[PDB]
Write an enzyme that holds these catalytic residues in place. Structure first.
Site, PDB file in Angstrom:
ATOM      1  N   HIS A 123       1.088  -1.139  -0.070  1.00 30.44           N
ATOM      2  CA  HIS A 123       0.056  -0.402  -0.044  1.00 30.44           C
ATOM      3  C   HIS A 123       0.635   1.926  -0.249  1.00 30.44           C
ATOM      4  O   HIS A 123       0.091   2.468  -0.123  1.00 30.44           O
ATOM      5  CB  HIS A 123      -1.240  -0.228   1.279  1.00 30.44           C
ATOM      6  CG  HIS A 123      -0.227  -0.020   2.620  1.00 30.44           C
ATOM      7  ND1 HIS A 123       0.278   1.354   2.763  1.00 30.44           N
ATOM      8  CD2 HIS A 123      -0.265  -0.794   3.345  1.00 30.44           C
ATOM      9  CE1 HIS A 123       0.374   1.134   4.065  1.00 30.44           C
ATOM     10  NE2 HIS A 123       0.018  -0.072   4.824  1.00 30.44           N
ATOM     11  N   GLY A 183       3.322   6.893  10.288  1.00 28.00           N
ATOM     12  CA  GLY A 183       4.922   6.208   9.591  1.00 28.00           C
ATOM     13  C   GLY A 183       5.140   4.976  10.350  1.00 28.00           C
ATOM     14  O   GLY A 183       6.070   4.194   9.497  1.00 28.00           O
ATOM     15  N   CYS A 199       3.898   1.676   9.487  1.00 25.37           N
ATOM     16  CA  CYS A 199       3.963   0.928   8.390  1.00 25.37           C
ATOM     17  C   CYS A 199       5.406  -0.779   8.197  1.00 25.37           C
ATOM     18  O   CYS A 199       6.481   0.400   7.463  1.00 25.37           O
ATOM     19  CB  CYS A 199       3.284   1.045   7.316  1.00 25.37           C
ATOM     20  SG  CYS A 199       1.155   1.916   8.090  1.00 25.37           S
TER      21      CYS A 199
END
Ligand SMILES: Cc1ccsc1CNC(=O)c1ccccc1
Ligand SMILES: [Cl-]
Ligand code: NA
Ligand code: NA
Lengths: 300, 306
Positions: free
Chosen positions: B41, B143, B145
């Site tokens: 993503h 932040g 991920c």
């Protein structure tokens, strides 16, 4: 979201961890630049344990009596000296993995990460706090002495604890990296006992602010308290006194959540009176006191 | 003495964390050999997230659209492809810090260490269990991920989790390192919810054994039970079933402490039905289920990872 007891990443400390052998005793050492720091009680013998004279024991030793092993490598000891209760072994190699670092002596209530180590190699990392009675509630087995506690601000490692010994109640005592013990303890096997421990009030309040920040308000109430009346109630539950310093320190969190510090204190008074009644706060059914105001702001 | 929630030393994984930027989005990547792994993503805008077509979003991207920083050094991306929900960015340099590693998929109940990261920089390490409902009770902010979860057995790092999203209840969802989600979730902005969770019975039993090893014994009693009998109680209290495999895995601790699994089951039965009566176990007023039997043995024996 979420709130967890988090430790600092251990890698900068892992690269410093060595094994120190003297006689039949093996424990861990901390290798920074060309110095290895370890508990001086590594030179104790079995008959020395109650009243060792460390100056007398040390003067009898030569550099080659100290074996220092970094991974698969023997380091050469080229000098030795004692500072308070730590031994400083000069070695013939600067540690190429030495991080930016400092030595900091901390105050009760402060938190830090512990890198538990056996035979110079790291086993696990967890979070601790300096209890008001100057012990810590660690996880330490035989061979863990010389394991250290640290924080990491930016990229700088602040070393604040070196493990020395376990008291009869199963809690732990140790020194800063200048070798001064936390609390009234001594590196002798003479009978010693931690004082009665208390709850770190400012930290509990911090953690209540953390619960609000993560969306929980069930424990708040419409009341406030004077600072003195709060302390009069809280000490009946074995809580540490809350000082104006602590109130000041809680300022930022109070502004972020909109809950005045003394309003939160009234919520805490009620929680002590009522308990949880089957509810939880941030996943706990007890009030948590090993998160500082600084920890809460950095995690939330 | 003592018993703490304890993570693996994180240094071997810290040397693999890099920063990955695509357009206005920055998150973390895992750099192993000559590949950087991160959530697919990363290529979406906020609108894309509503109903992404990832292969179509990807073909517009060139290698030079993926900015990868390892420390303050740029890595050159020379190839990109997807595997399930992770993006694989082939780079021109092998990570000289690559540890001995494998990709493994864990089962619910198993624990692992999370290295929480932001902008490619490790910020904290903590222990998690994969919940029965396939979420984890993590601590992640925007932040985070691409932060990863792992175990270490010997000197081999077993990577088992990559962080992808936060669910509305504040728990977290992610994939293994081959991009397969844990649980019935998808990487898209849509209505998603954690299912009702249960308690990891074998882990609670392990923690009770840890308590006993540490001198915390008030909950022991004279009784024993049977698996069928105890599992009816477990069901009633939203506890996972206890299998014969669990009993066998707890074997070591049963011999070491002199308390059989069904004997300690009878302690747990009584705790569920009567509560704790104002007492605590290892400092907790709740029954703790995020320690496996292996976790208890390893911490109460000092295993290390040089
Ligand atoms: C905490 C402390 C204080 C003085 S010594 C010590 C720990 N070290 C030993 O107890 C020991 C030393 C040599 C042989 C066997 C045991
Ligand atoms: Cl301090
Ligand atoms: Na080492
Ligand atoms: Na029993």
């Amino acid at each position: 979201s979420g709130f967890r007891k988090m430790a600092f990443p251990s890698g900068k400390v892992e690269g410093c961890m060595v094994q120190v052998t003297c006689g039949t005793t093996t424990l861990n050492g901390l290798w920074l630049d060309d110095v290895v720091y370890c508990p001086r009680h590594v030179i104790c013998t079995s008959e020395d344990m109650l009243n060792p004279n460390y100056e007398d024991l040390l003067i009898r030793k030569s550099n080659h009596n100290f074996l220092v092993q970094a991974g698969n490598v023997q380091l050469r000891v080229i000098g030795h000296s004692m500072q308070n209760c730590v031994l400083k072994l000069k070695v013939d190699t600067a540690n190429p993995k030495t991080p930016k670092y400092k030595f900091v002596r901390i105050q009760p209530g402060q938190t830090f990460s512990v890198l538990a180590c056996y035979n110079g190699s790291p086993s696990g990392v967890y979070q601790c706090a300096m209890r008001p009675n100057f012990t810590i509630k660690g996880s330490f087995l035989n061979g863990s002495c010389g394991s250290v506690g640290f924080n990491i601000d930016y990229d700088c490692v602040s070393f604040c604890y070196m493990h020395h010994m376990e008291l009869p109640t199963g809690v732990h005592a140790g020194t800063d990296l200048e070798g001064n013990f936390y609390g009234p303890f001594v590196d002798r096997q003479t009978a010693q006992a931690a004082g009665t421990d208390t709850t770190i009030t400012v930290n509990v309040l911090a953690w209540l602010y953390a619960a609000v920040i993560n969306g929980d308000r069930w424990f708040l109430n419409r009341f406030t308290t004077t600072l003195n009346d709060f302390n009069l109630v809280a000490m009946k539950y074995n809580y540490e006194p809350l000082t104006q310093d602590h109130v000041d320190i809680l300022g930022p969190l109070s502004a972020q959540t909109g809950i005045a510090v003394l309003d939160m204190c009234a919520s805490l008074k009620e929680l002590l009176q009522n308990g949880m009644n089957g509810r939880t706060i941030l996943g706990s059914a007890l009030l948590e006191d090993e998160f500082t105001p600084f920890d809460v702001v950095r995690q939330c």
